[PDB]
Structure formats: C-alpha cells, structure tokens
Amino acid sequence: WAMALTPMEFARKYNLLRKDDEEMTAGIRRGDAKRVFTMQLGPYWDGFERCSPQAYALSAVFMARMNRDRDAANNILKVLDKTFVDGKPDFSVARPVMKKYQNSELVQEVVAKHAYVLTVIASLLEAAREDGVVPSSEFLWLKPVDRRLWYMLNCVGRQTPYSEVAGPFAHWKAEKEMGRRSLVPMIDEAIRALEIAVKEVRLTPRQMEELEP
Amino acid sequence: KGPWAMALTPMEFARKYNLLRKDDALLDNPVPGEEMTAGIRRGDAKRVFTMQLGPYWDGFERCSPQAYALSAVFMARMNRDRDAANNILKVLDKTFVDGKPDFSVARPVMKKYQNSELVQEVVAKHAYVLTVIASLLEAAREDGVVPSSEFLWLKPVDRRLWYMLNCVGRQTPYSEVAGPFAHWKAEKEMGRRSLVPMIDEAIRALEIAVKEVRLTPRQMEELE
C-alpha cells in the first residue's frame, strides 16, 4: 500500500505548517503536533485480550521467541502467512501461545516497563531479537492489516522513525530511558525532530503564500 | 475493494462479468436435481477467460518487472543457486517496507540463467508469460519449498500474477485466473506451447460451480 509520509508530507497532511517570524521555510504548530503525536500513541496496554487481534498475535510470536520456543513462534507466522493468502488471517492460532507465555518472567518484565500497547510490543520485538533475526519480512501481511503497527515494528532497531509513528517511537525510547512505564505522553522528541526536518525543506512561493500565522 | 480484496467466488465472478443467464436446458426439460439455478453465457465467458491469459511470452525483458524478478528467483532455484534466489527475495522485501522494490536486482540473475537448459525447456513448452512463470515455479519447487508467502508483496502490484502463482499445486484455481490456469494445464497435456487459447476447462468449471448455487425466485426472474 502507500509509501510512508515524509516529514513535510506529514506536516502538510495534519495542517502543522506555520508562518515563522532559512528563506522560504515553514515553522511548526507545536501544540497541534503534540496532539497528533499523542494520537499516534494508541491505546494503553491493559491486558493482551484487549489488544487488536494483530497486536495480540504478533505479541504471542515474540513472547514465544523470548521464551526460546521457535516452533510455537513459527507456527503462528506460518498459519498467518497461509491464511493471509486465503483471505482472512486466523489470529486465534495465537491464543494458545499467549496463554502459555503472557505470565512468563521476561514478558512480565516488558509489560511492567511500558504503558502503551505499541511500546509493549516494540520491546517484545526487541527482546525476541536476542534469540534470532525476526524481520518484518516474516510478517509482510501486517502492512495492509494495520499500518501504524507495521511502521512501529519496522522502526525497532532504527535510530530515526517514520513520522507516522514518531509519537509512539519517542515515547517508547522515553520509557526505556526513564526505566519505568509512563502514562503521561513523552513525545517532545517527535516535535523537535519534525521542526528540524521541516526547516530543511524549501517551499515554493505558492506554498509560502498559503501559510497562516 | 482496493488492492487487498479477497478473491471472487465463482458466483461473484459470474455476476461481475454478466455471465449469468436463464438455463433453457432445464426450462425445456426440468430436472428435479437442479431447480432454481442459472446458466452461463459461454461466449461471453470465453472472452473473459481469454482476457485473463495476458501477454504472449516474448523474451523476459518484455515481461512486467515483477514477472521478470520472480522468474529470475525461480530460474535460480531451478539451477540450485538458492543464494541468488534469496538475495532477490531479501531485497524485494526490504524495499517494500517503505518505498518501491528493487526489481533491477533480478537483472544479473536473469542474465545468468535465462538460457540455461532447464529454463529453455520451460520456455519452449509455454506460450504466455503466466504459463511460463507457472511452470518455472513448479520446477523451482523440485529444489525445495518456495511458498507464495515470500512474495506476499506481489498481491498489491499484480493481482492476476499473484493468484496465478498461488494456484500452482492447487487442483482448482480462483475464477479470476481460471483462464491461464486452464491454458497452462492444456499446454502440459498437449506437450507443446499453444498460442490459440485453450480455456474450455475454465468455462466447464464455471458452469458446474454456478449450478451448485440455488437462486431465490426473484433472482431467477432477473436472469436473462
């Protein structure tokens, strides 16, 4: 499906550009950007049963790999790949695995330290990678099912996220740096990165004339 | 709807292409076994199935870039160069995350293997791009498993190619590739390539499929 938005396209898509007051450059609406990034953070973690089916199922894959059970992990990934051909993925294949590993030590440690679904599952993926490679390419089907999740998970191991998940990315890294879960959004790093990225791009005269204060 | 839609069932396919009609074989001589069932417009069905066949094979360089690259992957497998095959699959996968795939990555492998004996045997025996590639996939599966999983990304770029390759090893194809599947089988049965479309099995199968679905009274009356 669609390419990830660049910082400028993202800013334009969410009406984040402002007259600043270097030539032919826009500023950012910080309050507005804060809210957009806060919106990207998604739901609080509050038991895996309340996760979307896709986050449920990939969490289970990663829990399996953390607990060194490649077979259970590959069986989910395998069934989801086939069933995806067919038309609708069978997320229920993940239920047995969740039941078995959701209360394991290494998983409880991740859940303890992260307040949002997206930041839990990012750290489950990071931890699963201490066992083996776990590429996005084992779960190609995710992009059309859930774009935000796909982008979050493809940013695990990266320095700089896609703007469309810059919120949950910044929050995730803030939680790791604080050493605790945070329910208060910690997304300021996403704002500063957007401002920097936007000031690098020149606007045309038409685009400058369309800027409001 | 959109690039990710599920495959049409036979009855949905027949409706989409206006292939249903009143069946005058059971109007003129009703069988208890078949009340309330439509017939198929055989001439319109031939056209539609023939339109799914796609272009003649005429040098891999004339193929779509996705058909090009996948052919190269299967070529490499047929020739037992798993590394060259997997590199293409890695690069295609990486590039699909965010932007647009590196199909050019396939060019060295195509250059290398396209005139190989096992590839020349397949190309000799099939007349259409879809039928060539189906047979390259079937041959590449002599080497090892080559699941359609690995080219997940094809579905959005080329719906037809994706369903075609997912029916390799199936006994019954999706209606939307029933034409080239039928033709590919007819080629293997004849033992030569055929430019004349051999899509009769696609029509028979659609007729049979449609006869299994009871219509409502209203639906029977709307039939022409």
Numbering used by the authors:
A (entry chain A): 159 to 179, 189 to 380
B (entry chain B): 156 to 379
Paste lines from the article:
Thus, a shorter construct (residues 153–380, referred thereafter as DotM153) was cloned, expressed, and purified. DotM153 crystals however diffracted to 1.8 Å resolution. These crystals contained two molecules in the asymmetric unit. The DotM153 crystal structure is similar to that published by Kwak et al. (PDB entry code 5 × 1U; root mean square deviation (RMSD) in Cα atoms of 0.4 Å) and reveals an all-α-helical fold, comprising 13 α-helices connected by loops, many of them proline-rich. Residues 179–188 in monomer A in the loop connecting helices α1 and α2 were not resolved, indicating flexibility in this region of the protein. The pear-shape structure is formed of a narrower end made by two elongated sequences emanating from both the N- and C-terminal regions of the sequence: α1, α2, and part of the α3 on one side and α13 and α12 on the other. The remaining α-helices (α4 to α11) form a larger compact structure with helices α7, α8, α9, and α10 tightly wrapping around a helical bundle formed by α4, α5, and α6. While the structural homology search and structure-based sequence alignment yielded no clue as to the function of DotM, functional implications could however be derived from a striking feature of the DotM153 structure: its highly charged surface. Indeed, DotM153 contains 33 surface-exposed Lys/Arg and 28 surface-exposed Glu/Asp residues scattered around the entire surface of the protein. Peptides CegC3, Lpg1663, and OSM that contain a Glu-rich motif exhibited high affinity to DotM153 (KD values of 0.19, 0.7, and 0.35 μM, respectively), whereas Lem21 and LegC8 which do not contain C-terminal Glu-rich motifs did not bind.
